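Newbie here. two chains, one complex. Structure please?
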Amino acid sequence: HFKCIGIVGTHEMLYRWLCDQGYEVIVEKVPTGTLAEIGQQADLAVVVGGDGNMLGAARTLARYDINVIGINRGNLGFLTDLDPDNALQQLSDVLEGRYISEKRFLLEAQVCQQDRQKRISTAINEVVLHPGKVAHMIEFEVYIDETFAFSQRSDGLIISTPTGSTAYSLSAGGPILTPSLDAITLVPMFPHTLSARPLVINSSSTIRLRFSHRDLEISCDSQIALPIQEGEDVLIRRCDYHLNLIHPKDYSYFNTLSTKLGWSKKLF
Amino acid sequence: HFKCIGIVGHTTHEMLYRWLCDQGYEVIVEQQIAHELQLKNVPTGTLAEIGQQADLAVVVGGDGNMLGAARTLARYDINVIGINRGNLGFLTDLDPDNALQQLSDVLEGRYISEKRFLLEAQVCQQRISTAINEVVLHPGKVAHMIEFEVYIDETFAFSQRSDGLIISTPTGSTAYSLSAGGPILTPSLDAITLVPMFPHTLSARPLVINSSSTIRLRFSHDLEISCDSQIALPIQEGEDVLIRRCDYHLNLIHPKDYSYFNTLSTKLGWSKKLF
């Protein structure tokens, strides 16, 4: 069972039913808090508003010992299970201890000058290396676990988690990775080498990107881009914390995947 | 220190045998290849006997020969090293023009150990094969469409109309799967990939799952399963196919200077250092 529930992001209805059930509730006219304070104080965070603000919530809430469940606003998401009409019924089951866990790992991207960290961001979806101004070709060397792997001339590079594999990565031709796979995918953006193909590596591996000495940036989950100045390199690795995501007992990842991508669900 | 060395895989064979014997090793040669090379006064054993008793098997003749050997050798506590046909392989590390020098280093204990998992296919009536690269579901008639349901860890996932389905290990991901548009998986990853073969659904994409997951294929009441380079095996009406990771792994050993990414980039023509 859970003690303290946070509501983050029906919004009026949720608070009232939870109070009536005996739970301490903290919300973003009444205990209130910042997202990080809710992460700190609550055992369960209910996020309102589909995959969109769940993404923003996720990066902070991943830092805490807190379970996270999302209530979408009508249509299926990968991170948001509850439909508003069935919300209370399912949330009731979850509160009784009846739920599925789906830990989602995150990426940490550092811009480094030798050993000095200059900039840092995190991503639940992807990190994208790209030029300052788009469609212009760039060159980079990829090192995996500090060993030279290959170089590339391209529009850039997408490094995606399993969570991110159905997002931008998928639109760039990447493979789908099941949500808890211990893997990271590197997906080139329009490579000059026609034999280039997405590469899937162990999520325990580190990726170092190096650049010519003579305007590059990285974007993490489409947050504001981090500049990469001359002589700097990028280090990407798995974060040492994950998003504790939970789902109702009738959750089926493959049902969600097939439904969102328009795959056949026909039986003979 | 290895004591008993098997030579497996169907002129390089003879050089190896003579050299290893000169070095004082107990050498045994796979029975079929000894007879095929028409060898004289050379001791032989079955591939299984070699797998269960030798410390090391040296596989001659490139990646193709390694596939056949590996399905038996994987079952056992034996180290396995391969000699390529000249050009690099993904499974065979040794250059036949420098095999004696390279193997010498390995025999002195300079090597890195790596485990490769295999797939097991079961044809279920509520028959088995294994594969180190891939299991391919397809019809008897090439370029004919088939329909099938896919379950992953027994949960219904999707149906497909296509020419078939490739289920590949990380080892197989550079093989048939790659030609079919699949991703490259680093050889040690605990993952398998499902790659559709010309699916009618244009949003179908390669899917990568945990190697601890099972896959079940269900059909309408001429379907076949092909594992690596083995003959196609018929699926009778009413039968489902179940695919899972084998309980045993190939104990591959590599020269100390082995670099997966160097082999990958060389074989696929990817660019090397720039700066």
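Moderator note: The two ends of chain A are 42 Å apart (CA to CA). Residues 99 and 129 of chain A are 37 Å apart (CA to CA). Thread marked as resolved.
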